[PDB]
Amino acid sequence: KAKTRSSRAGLQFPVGRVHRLLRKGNYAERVGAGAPVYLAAVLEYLTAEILELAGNAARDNKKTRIIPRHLQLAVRNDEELNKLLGRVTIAQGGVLPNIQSVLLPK
Amino acid sequence: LRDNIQGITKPAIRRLARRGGVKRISGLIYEETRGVLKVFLENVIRDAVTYTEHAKRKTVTAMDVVYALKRQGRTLYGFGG
Amino acid sequence: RDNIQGITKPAIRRLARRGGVKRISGLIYEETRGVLKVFLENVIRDAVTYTEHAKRKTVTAMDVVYALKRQGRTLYGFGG
């Protein structure tokens, strides 16, 4: 009976693949055991906050499935992602529904 | 094919700018926004054809496209990492 | 704190003068000091984070240009 490293770490992201990536990535001469565990831990978090904000967007747009418009609303409404990923354009996102105040009718 | 830059009807440039939230459009914009494109696509396509021929490939790959966008600071998502 | 007003109004004019600016509003100075501090805490947050990585308790010009490197800008003659 062989258990996975993710269940040892209590994560759903896999330590094995990301260790195989960190190694083939040649980031350093030796990679330790805890570095892929910590790496998978942070990636699942940032995959989660983004997915939970996308789920809030889907609820507000009253949809039962995530569409990249929900992803765009998730990344653009959060200002912290807006300088994490304001460098980033995503597929089929559109823009925020913003109108400058001087363009409004009097 | 030649001078297909006109293929983007002003109707389109405006739809984009409309997407941008502007109200009025000047008349001599259309040559210039299109210009922001001829120069932008030429350097993008230069980086893309550089990766194309360097990777022994004779087909320009969408991979090579998002790869070149990753380099120049105008990266794109949804087409592989 | 006390040194944020230490970046004086003629000095801001000297930066503007080095910057080719002829006329300067009176409200430039304090919010320009604010733009300076937001830039400073960003750069020194990166530089100090590099510093306690090294098991160190002083920051170095090397760590500064290193933070600048992360932020994107590079400085010469200060190490690196």
Add this chain to the structure above:
Amino acid sequence: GGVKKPHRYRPGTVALREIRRYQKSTELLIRKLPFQRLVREIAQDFKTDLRFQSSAVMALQEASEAYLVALFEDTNLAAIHAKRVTIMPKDIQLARRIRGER
């Protein structure tokens, strides 16, 4: 006596209405075939007779739209900067200048 007048939305009403409609659309604007050709003529002097994958064009167009729309909000800001609602060629020249590519 009473002569008719047509029902015409006023200058700006139709504008802002299609603004709200287009800022909810994610669909690409520049049409596909017109754009695809935009590329095949640019990729001539670099090298002749290229082939392109069935994704590269889509990636390069939607990418161009993203670049152009992002240029267009700060173009709008530059037009509002001079207390105007009309954008001008100087606005995007300044935009590209301050991004650092003019």
Add this chain to the structure above:
Amino acid sequence: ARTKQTARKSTGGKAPRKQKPHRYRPGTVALREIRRYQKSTELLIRKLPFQRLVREIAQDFKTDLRFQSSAVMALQEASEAYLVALFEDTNLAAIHAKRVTIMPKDIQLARRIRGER
């Protein structure tokens, strides 16, 4: 009846207690000194105030942080470089709106379009 206290002193007398000359036109000298601060190479923020700035502003991130002498000089230079680029961008966004004088709103737009607001 609204009242307020300003003396801020419960008792008075706290001190006595046991506990023909040439004038260049408005604008004339400025271009002479644009050139002076441009041909010059010194650092335009006084080192002692800026040193004290970096000390007072770095203390909140990490306690007892020492700076190499060259480290603050790299900061001094980087900040002046940052501000002269931002002020060229300022002068450009100011000359845009049919103006010579700048106003903060120039530089909030200059920062907004560069993508840090």
Add this chain to the structure above:
Amino acid sequence: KTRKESYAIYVYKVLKQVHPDTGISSKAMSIMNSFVNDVFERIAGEASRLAHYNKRSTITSREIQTAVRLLLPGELAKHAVSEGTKAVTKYTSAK
């Protein structure tokens, strides 16, 4: 060979952990896969850099932290450090 390698089922399971009622389309899922790949490369690269600056030779969990705190903006950071530290704590507790 034929095998192409991506974070499909993993992001699906963490989605079910967050929302066990919500779907996904394939191209949004490619958005997620390219996004986690990109943030992985940023965090791993910075780490590699930190190490080479400190004359070290190995990517300790420490570097990934100095990194996560160096790259991700603050709000995401402290929470990422918290979850990564409790994750590696769980890893060493379960050996």
Add this chain to the structure above:
Amino acid sequence: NEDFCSACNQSGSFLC
């Protein structure tokens, strides 16, 4: 309301 008296131009407790 000001921080000085309008009659004697001195600080103190004021009726506003």
